Design a protein around this ligand. Structure first.
Ligand SMILES: CCCCCCCCCC(=O)N(CCO)C[C@@H](O)[C@@H](O)[C@@H](O)[C@@H](O)CO
Ligand SMILES: CCCCCCCCCC(=O)N(CCO)C[C@@H](O)[C@@H](O)[C@@H](O)[C@@H](O)CO
Ligand SMILES: CC(C)NC[C@H](O)COc1cccc2[nH]c3ccccc3c12
Ligand code: NA
Length: 297
């Protein structure tokens, strides 16, 4: 037995150590591929950078510690770092879904009103939107956790708060529902609604083609190119997290209905999404050229 443990430990410390690499590496790749490639410095890729820092923090901070928790069974870093870890964990997920939301709206405006967009949206502004998207996210994730709004009266929760070795995120039903709606479900329904519109209008444009000029076109042509890449990016994020949050809502009405491992599974599917973006950006010939550039092929 005491050996069958040892296998699973170092065996799992291998996957954990691996995903960290695939996450950090992949995203640092994406941040450099924009930070040093003239044609990959669109406005949209400023958000993609933002999006890639959320994922980057996930790989340096969220997972490492979350690793040492699945593997070693307990929490080893004290009751404070438990809160901070949980906050950073919640922050990144909200900040992601929020940037993915902006990115959706952003395209919609640039596709339907390619104009008011071009004059209104400046790089200096886009940063203010990124800052605003983090500022909100921070506020919704960190503060309520800091103020213990999440805690339960239940003896389960109560005992887990007492123990500096428990770092289960046992949350009262209210925080569950409220925080999952604010941080996830609304942003997601907005993003899906906007994304279906951006898809429909994108179709009507190609349906009504070479009816526009070469000037009215070589500026639409450019913004359409990369839509599908983004539509994937969104569609994956949705599938990677919807289960975790579907299960979270289910767990409110009916604790002891969906197995605790399936819960932790899904949360890990969620962290997995942080390493899927760069792989998906390899659709783009420019990113691919930039990744080879950086790896020194
Ligand atoms: C952006 C975050 C969204 C806000 C979520 C926090 C609100 C939680 C409500 C509150 O103020 N509580 C006490 C504050 O400590 C929690 C209690 O409501 C809770 O203990 C129970 O009454 C029910 O939740 C039953 O599960
Ligand atoms: C972001 C919200 C979701 C945006 C969805 C974008 C769909 C636009 C239509 C589309 O992607 N194609 C037309 C057939 O449906 C295929 C090709 O256009 C594509 O492979 C590339 O060539 C790029 O032009 C991407 O538009
Ligand atoms: C068990 C903890 C450490 N894992 C948290 C997940 O990574 C992400 O969970 C969330 C992300 C964003 C908003 C959230 N609201 C929640 C309410 C209850 C449970 C998780 C979340 C949650
Ligand atoms: Na604790």
């Amino acid at each position: 037995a005491e050996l069958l443990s040892q296998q699973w430990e170092a065996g799992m410390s291998l996957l954990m150590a691996l995903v960290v690499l695939l996450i950090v590496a992949g995203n640092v790749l994406v941040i450099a591929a924009i930070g040093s490639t003239q044609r990959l410095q669109t406005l949209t890729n400023l958000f993609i950078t933002s999006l890639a820092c959320a994922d980057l923090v996930v790989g340096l901070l969220v997972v490492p510690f979350g690793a040492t928790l699945v593997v070693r069974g307990t929490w080893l870093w004290g009751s404070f770092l438990c809160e901070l870890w949980t906050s950073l964990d919640v922050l990144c997920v909200t900040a992601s879904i929020e940037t993915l939301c902006v990115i959706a709206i952003d395209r919609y405006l640039a596709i339907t009103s390619p104009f008011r967009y071009q004059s209104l949206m400046t790089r200096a502004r886009a940063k203010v939107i990124i800052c605003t998207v983090w500022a909100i996210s921070a506020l919704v994730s960190f503060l309520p956790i800091m103020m213990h709004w999440w805690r339960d009266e239940d003896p389960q929760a109560l005992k887990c708060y007492q123990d500096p070795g428990c770092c289960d995120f046992v949350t009262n039903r209210a925080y569950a529902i409220a925080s999952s709606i604010i941080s996830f479900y609304i942003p997601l329904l907005i993003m899906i609604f906007v994304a279906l519109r951006v898809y429909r209008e994108a179709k009507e444009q190609i349906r009504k083609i070479d009816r526009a000029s070469k000037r009215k076109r070589v500026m639409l042509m450019r913004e359409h190119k990369a839509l599908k890449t983004l539509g994937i990016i969104m569609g994956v994020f949705t599938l990677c997290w919807l289960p975790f949050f579907l299960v979270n809502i289910v767990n409110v009405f009916n604790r002891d209905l969906v197995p605790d491992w399936l819960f932790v599974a899904f949360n890990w599917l969620g962290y997995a999404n942080s390493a899927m973006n760069p792989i998906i950006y390899c659709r783009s010939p420019d990113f691919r050229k930039a990744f080879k550039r950086l790896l020194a092929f």
